[PDB]
């Protein structure tokens, strides 16, 4: 015999803190966005808890994994969990499960570990609803516009890498650290749940000016670190732009390409 636990993950604006909801309440998150792609592990902490209930403070050391999941488009994951489980000596007991977030959405803090005993109070549909709190964190962005220095018109197709003070270069990955194919223009790290990593120059992500000259990204952690945009692919007939120091301060600024001179 199992109970269905439905976990729903909602993001609110930075200074809005949702009221807790009981397990028997179906809440639509009025005022929030569902958070997709958030990874959880559910630990079977029955044995840890029943070793000494009054001393239990959320340890999942040595606890078996009861399930793993990832939130879908509705911010949800659903898992059927046995309402009874064995303690360490093999005696059956009311099951206890601990929910541990292993991979938050880009732009969000992780939620705190929580745990519950089954059977839990269920809503009218028989499901047990939990709503872990993911607080939005401030992140920063930067946009560049590539232009022809002489005409001042926007220039498409110019390639750049971004370096930090250690001489490492930015490579975007997906939520699991795998390579992604990054196209032209401004890269919405937050919308795609990407990650910023720092690697050798030859493994770095190339950012490319689009038809409006634009490139850049969001999802930087701070606005105090200095990075450098370095030209790597120069449109034929131009001289390479000079390196551009910047901070992720949410600004747009221009990068100029001088037409190469032809003398007589």
Round to whole Å and give the CA distance between 37 and 42.
16
Residue in this structure with the two tokens 């939130």, named with its chain if needed: 71
User: Which CATH number is 210's domain given?
Assistant: 2.60.40.10
* 140-148/252-257 β-pairing: parallel
- One domain, residues 38 and 110: yes
- One domain, residues 32 and 119: yes
- One domain, residues 129 and 147: no
* Residue of 163, 205, 168 lying closest to 184 (CA atoms): 205
- One domain, residues 133 and 152: no
Contact 95, 84 (CB under 8 A): yes
- One domain, residues 202 and 95: no
- One domain, residues 43 and 118: yes
- One domain, residues 181 and 132: no
User: In angstroms, what is the resolution?
Assistant: 2.0
- One domain, residues 128 and 148: no
Residue in this structure with the two tokens 């962005």, named with its chain if needed: 141
- One domain, residues 73 and 185: no
Round to whole Å and give the CA distance between 161 and 205.
6
Total number of domains constituting the chain? 2
* Structural domain of 241: 138-264
Using CA atoms, how far residue 23 sits from 17, 66, 131, 132, in Å, is 18, 19, 9, 11
Handedness of CA 146, 184, 244, 138 (dihedral sign): positive
Q: Which SS3 state, helix, strand or coil, does residue 248 take?
A: coil
- One domain, residues 34 and 118: yes
- One domain, residues 114 and 167: no
Contact 74, 46 (CB under 8 A): no
């Amino acid at each position: 015999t199992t109970q269905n636990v439905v976990l729903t993950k909602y993001g609110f604006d930075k200074d809005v803190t949702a009221i807790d909801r009981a397990t028997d309440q179906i809440w639509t998150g009025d005022g929030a966005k569902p958070l997709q792609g958030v990874d959880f592990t559910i630990y079977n902490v029955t044995a840890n808890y029943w070793a000494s209930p009054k001393d239990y403070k959320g340890s999942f050391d040595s606890a078996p994994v009861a399930a793993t999941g990832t939130t879908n488009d509705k911010g949800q994951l659903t898992q059927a969990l046995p309402i009874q489980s064995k303690d360490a000596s093999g005696k059956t007991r009311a099951a206890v499960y601990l929910f541990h977030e292993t991979n938050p959405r880009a732009g969000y803090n992780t939620s705190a570990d929580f745990w519950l005993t089954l059977p839990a109070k269920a809503a009218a549909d028989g499901n047990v609803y939990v709503y872990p709190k993911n607080v939005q964190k401030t992140t920063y962005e930067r946009t560049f516009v590539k232009k022809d220095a002489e005409t001042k018109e926007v220039l498409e197709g110019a390639g750049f890498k971004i370096s930090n003070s250690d001489g490492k270069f930015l490579k975007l990955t997906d939520k699991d650290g795998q390579s992604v194919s990054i196209g032209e223009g401004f890269i919405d790290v937050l919308a795609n749940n990407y990650r910023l990593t720092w690697v050798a120059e030859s493994d770095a992500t190339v950012f490319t000016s689009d038809k409006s000259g634009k490139f850049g990204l969001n999802g930087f952690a701070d606005n105090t670190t200095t990075y450098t945009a370095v030209a790597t692919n120069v449109p034929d007939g131009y001289d390479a732009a000079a390196n551009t120091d910047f901070k992720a301060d949410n600004s747009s600024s221009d990068i100029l390409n001088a037409p190469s001179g032809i003398l007589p």
